Amino acid sequence: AGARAMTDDDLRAAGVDRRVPEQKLGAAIDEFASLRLPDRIDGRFVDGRRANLTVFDDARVAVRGHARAQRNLLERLETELLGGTLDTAGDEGGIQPDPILQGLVDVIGQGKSDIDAYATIVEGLTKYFQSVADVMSKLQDYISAKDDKNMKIDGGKIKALIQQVIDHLPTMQLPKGADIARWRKELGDAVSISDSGVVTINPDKLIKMRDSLPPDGTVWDTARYQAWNTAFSGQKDNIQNDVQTLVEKYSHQNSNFDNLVKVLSGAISTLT
């Protein structure tokens, strides 16, 4: 009933602790960055780190947790504001305007939509993110020491892995009523949005990684592999960068939400 929400504590106490989804999201980014391709050093061969796909796992359901907590607080806030003390003949709701209550309701709905949308988008990017990290581990089965001066890389097969990720790239769908124009500008080049609100991920960075590979059975000297490794790993870093940026935008949204329920709560108090 009394949907209390005046301090960051009141929130957390309700389970709405924005620090968690972002810690996990940070966790993953940390994982994705720890990924390394095999290498050859001083004449030796160094295994790479295969992606701990779990770390990704704990990030997305938290983001899914939070959006439920955020959505259950807004709802509680919204039940309180609409009605409260009755009079006689007024179910009051977009029929006999004049009150400012109306305006808060819409603020709320924008709150809903925003919560959902960032949740779906972040859902998807982390999928995409997990897929790429799956590949940076799967492709390591296709690289190995040949001579004590050469490497073997079955790039034809790695091209295969990368392409599968590109064919089953996570598809996103923005809530009914969103201003797609505002969303394309905010999420940037990393993604593209139709007009039905269908969010898709730009496979451009995966394409360059894919087009960078040699054919299956190639044998490389250490200088050649290093060059490829660096070039490959730099594009991977490029992807980390895109996900990091949306993660900051998402924490900003989590922040906006925190101020939102606060203003809404004092507001209800005011009219209370």
Coordinates of C-alpha atoms in Angstrom, one line a residue:
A1 CA 0.0 0.0 0.0
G2 CA 2.0 3.0 1.3
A3 CA 4.6 2.9 -1.5
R4 CA 7.4 4.6 0.3
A5 CA 10.4 5.6 -1.9
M6 CA 12.0 8.8 -0.6
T7 CA 15.6 7.6 -0.3
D8 CA 18.0 5.3 -2.0
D9 CA 17.6 3.1 1.1
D10 CA 13.8 2.9 0.8
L11 CA 14.6 1.5 -2.7
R12 CA 17.2 -1.1 -1.9
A13 CA 15.1 -2.2 1.1
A14 CA 12.5 -3.0 -1.7
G15 CA 15.2 -4.8 -3.8
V16 CA 15.7 -2.0 -6.2
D17 CA 19.4 -1.8 -5.9
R18 CA 20.8 -0.5 -9.2
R19 CA 24.4 -1.4 -8.1
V20 CA 23.7 -5.1 -8.7
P21 CA 22.8 -5.3 -12.4
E22 CA 25.7 -2.9 -13.1
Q23 CA 28.1 -4.9 -11.0
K24 CA 27.3 -8.1 -12.9
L25 CA 27.2 -6.2 -16.2
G26 CA 30.7 -5.0 -15.2
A27 CA 31.5 -8.6 -14.2
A28 CA 30.9 -9.8 -17.8
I29 CA 32.8 -7.0 -19.4
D30 CA 35.6 -8.0 -17.1
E31 CA 35.1 -11.6 -18.4
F32 CA 34.9 -10.6 -22.0
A33 CA 38.1 -8.6 -21.5
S34 CA 40.0 -11.5 -19.9
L35 CA 39.5 -13.5 -23.1
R36 CA 42.7 -14.0 -24.9
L37 CA 43.7 -15.9 -28.1
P38 CA 46.5 -18.5 -27.8
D39 CA 50.0 -17.0 -28.4
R40 CA 53.6 -18.0 -29.0
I41 CA 56.2 -16.4 -26.7
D42 CA 60.0 -17.0 -26.7
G43 CA 59.4 -20.1 -28.8
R44 CA 56.6 -21.4 -26.5
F45 CA 52.9 -21.8 -26.9
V46 CA 50.5 -20.1 -24.5
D47 CA 46.9 -21.3 -24.3
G48 CA 44.2 -18.7 -24.3
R49 CA 41.4 -18.1 -21.8
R50 CA 38.1 -19.7 -22.8
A51 CA 35.2 -17.5 -21.9
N52 CA 33.5 -18.1 -18.5
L53 CA 30.0 -18.1 -20.0
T54 CA 28.6 -18.2 -16.5
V55 CA 29.6 -14.6 -15.7
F56 CA 27.5 -13.4 -18.6
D57 CA 24.6 -15.5 -17.2
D58 CA 24.5 -13.7 -13.8
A59 CA 24.5 -10.3 -15.6
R60 CA 21.3 -10.8 -17.7
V61 CA 19.0 -12.3 -15.1
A62 CA 19.9 -9.5 -12.7
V63 CA 19.0 -7.0 -15.4
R64 CA 15.8 -9.0 -15.6
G65 CA 15.4 -9.1 -11.9
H66 CA 15.8 -5.3 -11.5
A67 CA 13.3 -4.5 -14.3
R68 CA 10.8 -6.5 -12.3
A69 CA 11.6 -4.7 -9.0
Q70 CA 11.6 -1.4 -10.8
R71 CA 8.3 -2.4 -12.4
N72 CA 6.8 -3.5 -9.1
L73 CA 7.7 -0.2 -7.3
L74 CA 6.2 1.9 -10.1
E75 CA 3.1 -0.1 -9.9
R76 CA 2.8 0.3 -6.2
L77 CA 3.5 4.1 -6.6
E78 CA 0.8 4.2 -9.3
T79 CA -1.9 2.4 -7.3
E80 CA -1.3 4.9 -4.5
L81 CA -1.6 8.0 -6.7
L82 CA -4.7 6.9 -8.6
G83 CA -7.6 7.3 -6.2
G84 CA -6.8 7.2 -2.5
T85 CA -9.6 9.3 -1.1
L86 CA -13.0 9.1 -2.7
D87 CA -15.8 11.6 -3.0
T88 CA -19.0 10.8 -4.9
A89 CA -19.0 10.4 -8.7
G90 CA -15.5 10.4 -10.1
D91 CA -13.6 7.3 -11.4
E92 CA -11.3 10.0 -12.8
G93 CA -9.3 8.8 -15.7
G94 CA -8.9 10.5 -19.1
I95 CA -12.6 11.2 -19.2
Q96 CA -13.2 14.4 -17.2
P97 CA -9.9 16.2 -17.4
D98 CA -8.5 19.2 -15.4
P99 CA -6.4 17.4 -12.7
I100 CA -2.6 17.1 -12.8
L101 CA -2.9 13.5 -11.7
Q102 CA -3.4 12.7 -15.4
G103 CA 0.1 14.1 -16.1
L104 CA 1.7 11.9 -13.5
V105 CA 0.1 8.8 -15.0
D106 CA 1.7 9.5 -18.3
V107 CA 5.1 10.1 -16.6
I108 CA 4.7 6.6 -15.1
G109 CA 3.9 4.9 -18.4
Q110 CA 7.0 6.5 -19.9
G111 CA 8.6 4.9 -16.8
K112 CA 7.2 1.5 -17.7
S113 CA 8.2 1.7 -21.3
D114 CA 11.7 2.9 -20.5
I115 CA 12.2 0.1 -18.0
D116 CA 11.0 -2.5 -20.5
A117 CA 12.9 -1.1 -23.4
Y118 CA 16.3 -0.8 -21.6
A119 CA 15.6 -4.3 -20.2
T120 CA 15.0 -5.8 -23.6
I121 CA 17.9 -4.0 -25.3
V122 CA 20.3 -4.9 -22.5
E123 CA 18.9 -8.5 -22.6
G124 CA 19.8 -8.7 -26.3
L125 CA 23.2 -7.0 -26.2
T126 CA 24.3 -9.4 -23.5
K127 CA 23.1 -12.3 -25.6
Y128 CA 25.1 -11.0 -28.5
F129 CA 27.9 -10.4 -26.1
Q130 CA 27.8 -13.9 -24.8
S131 CA 27.7 -15.3 -28.3
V132 CA 30.9 -13.5 -29.3
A133 CA 32.6 -14.7 -26.2
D134 CA 31.5 -18.2 -27.0
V135 CA 33.2 -17.8 -30.3
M136 CA 36.4 -16.4 -28.9
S137 CA 36.6 -19.7 -27.0
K138 CA 35.2 -22.1 -29.6
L139 CA 37.7 -20.8 -32.3
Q140 CA 40.6 -21.7 -30.0
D141 CA 40.0 -25.4 -30.9
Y142 CA 41.2 -24.3 -34.4
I143 CA 44.6 -22.9 -33.5
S144 CA 47.7 -24.8 -32.5
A145 CA 51.4 -25.1 -32.5
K146 CA 52.8 -26.6 -35.7
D147 CA 56.6 -26.3 -35.9
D148 CA 58.6 -24.6 -33.1
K149 CA 58.4 -21.5 -35.3
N150 CA 54.9 -21.9 -36.8
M151 CA 51.2 -22.0 -36.0
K152 CA 48.2 -23.6 -37.6
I153 CA 44.9 -21.8 -38.1
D154 CA 41.7 -23.3 -39.6
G155 CA 40.2 -19.9 -40.4
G156 CA 37.7 -21.4 -42.8
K157 CA 36.2 -23.1 -39.8
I158 CA 36.5 -20.0 -37.6
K159 CA 34.7 -18.0 -40.4
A160 CA 32.0 -20.6 -39.8
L161 CA 31.7 -19.9 -36.1
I162 CA 31.6 -16.2 -36.6
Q163 CA 29.0 -16.4 -39.3
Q164 CA 26.7 -18.5 -37.2
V165 CA 26.7 -15.8 -34.6
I166 CA 25.8 -13.3 -37.3
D167 CA 22.9 -15.4 -38.6
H168 CA 21.3 -15.8 -35.1
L169 CA 22.0 -12.3 -33.8
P170 CA 19.6 -11.5 -31.0
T171 CA 16.5 -9.6 -32.2
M172 CA 14.9 -6.9 -30.0
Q173 CA 11.4 -5.4 -29.8
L174 CA 10.7 -2.0 -28.4
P175 CA 7.4 -1.5 -26.4
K176 CA 4.3 -0.2 -28.2
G177 CA 4.5 3.6 -28.2
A178 CA 8.2 4.3 -28.2
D179 CA 9.7 7.2 -30.1
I180 CA 12.0 5.1 -32.3
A181 CA 13.7 8.3 -33.4
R182 CA 14.8 9.0 -29.8
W183 CA 16.0 5.4 -29.5
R184 CA 18.1 5.2 -32.7
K185 CA 19.9 8.4 -31.7
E186 CA 20.6 7.2 -28.1
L187 CA 21.7 3.6 -28.8
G188 CA 23.9 4.8 -31.6
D189 CA 25.5 3.0 -34.6
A190 CA 26.1 -0.3 -32.7
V191 CA 22.4 -1.0 -33.3
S192 CA 19.7 -0.3 -35.9
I193 CA 16.0 0.0 -35.4
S194 CA 13.2 -0.5 -37.9
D195 CA 9.9 1.4 -37.7
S196 CA 8.0 -1.5 -36.2
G197 CA 10.4 -1.0 -33.3
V198 CA 12.5 -4.0 -34.2
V199 CA 16.0 -3.6 -32.7
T200 CA 18.9 -5.3 -34.4
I201 CA 22.6 -5.4 -33.7
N202 CA 25.0 -4.1 -36.4
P203 CA 27.1 -7.2 -37.4
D204 CA 29.8 -4.9 -38.9
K205 CA 32.5 -5.7 -36.4
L206 CA 31.9 -9.5 -36.7
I207 CA 32.1 -9.1 -40.4
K208 CA 35.6 -7.6 -40.3
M209 CA 36.7 -10.3 -37.8
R210 CA 35.2 -12.9 -40.2
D211 CA 36.8 -11.4 -43.3
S212 CA 40.2 -11.4 -41.5
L213 CA 40.7 -15.1 -41.3
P214 CA 42.8 -17.2 -43.7
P215 CA 41.5 -20.5 -45.2
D216 CA 41.5 -23.8 -43.2
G217 CA 44.8 -25.5 -43.0
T218 CA 46.8 -22.2 -43.1
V219 CA 50.2 -22.3 -41.4
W220 CA 51.6 -19.0 -40.2
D221 CA 55.0 -17.9 -39.0
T222 CA 55.0 -16.2 -35.5
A223 CA 55.2 -12.7 -37.1
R224 CA 52.0 -13.3 -39.2
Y225 CA 50.0 -14.8 -36.4
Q226 CA 50.9 -11.9 -34.0
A227 CA 49.7 -9.4 -36.6
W228 CA 46.4 -11.2 -37.1
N229 CA 46.0 -11.7 -33.3
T230 CA 46.5 -8.0 -32.7
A231 CA 44.2 -7.0 -35.5
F232 CA 41.6 -9.6 -34.5
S233 CA 41.8 -8.7 -30.8
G234 CA 41.5 -4.9 -31.5
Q235 CA 38.2 -5.5 -33.3
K236 CA 37.1 -7.6 -30.3
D237 CA 38.0 -4.7 -28.1
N238 CA 35.9 -2.6 -30.5
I239 CA 33.0 -4.7 -29.5
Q240 CA 33.7 -4.5 -25.8
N241 CA 33.6 -0.7 -26.3
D242 CA 30.1 -0.8 -27.8
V243 CA 28.7 -2.9 -25.0
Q244 CA 30.4 -0.8 -22.3
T245 CA 28.8 2.4 -23.8
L246 CA 25.3 0.9 -23.7
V247 CA 26.0 -0.3 -20.2
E248 CA 26.7 3.3 -19.1
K249 CA 23.6 4.5 -20.8
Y250 CA 21.7 1.8 -19.0
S251 CA 23.0 2.7 -15.6
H252 CA 22.1 6.3 -16.4
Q253 CA 18.5 5.0 -17.0
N254 CA 18.7 3.1 -13.7
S255 CA 19.7 6.5 -12.1
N256 CA 16.8 8.3 -13.8
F257 CA 14.5 5.8 -12.5
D258 CA 15.8 6.3 -8.9
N259 CA 15.0 10.0 -9.2
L260 CA 11.7 9.2 -10.8
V261 CA 10.1 7.3 -8.0
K262 CA 11.4 9.9 -5.6
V263 CA 9.7 12.8 -7.3
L264 CA 6.6 10.6 -7.8
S265 CA 6.5 9.7 -4.1
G266 CA 6.9 13.3 -2.8
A267 CA 4.3 14.3 -5.4
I268 CA 1.7 11.9 -4.1
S269 CA 2.5 13.1 -0.6
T270 CA 1.9 16.7 -1.8
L271 CA -1.6 15.8 -3.2
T272 CA -2.1 13.4 -0.3

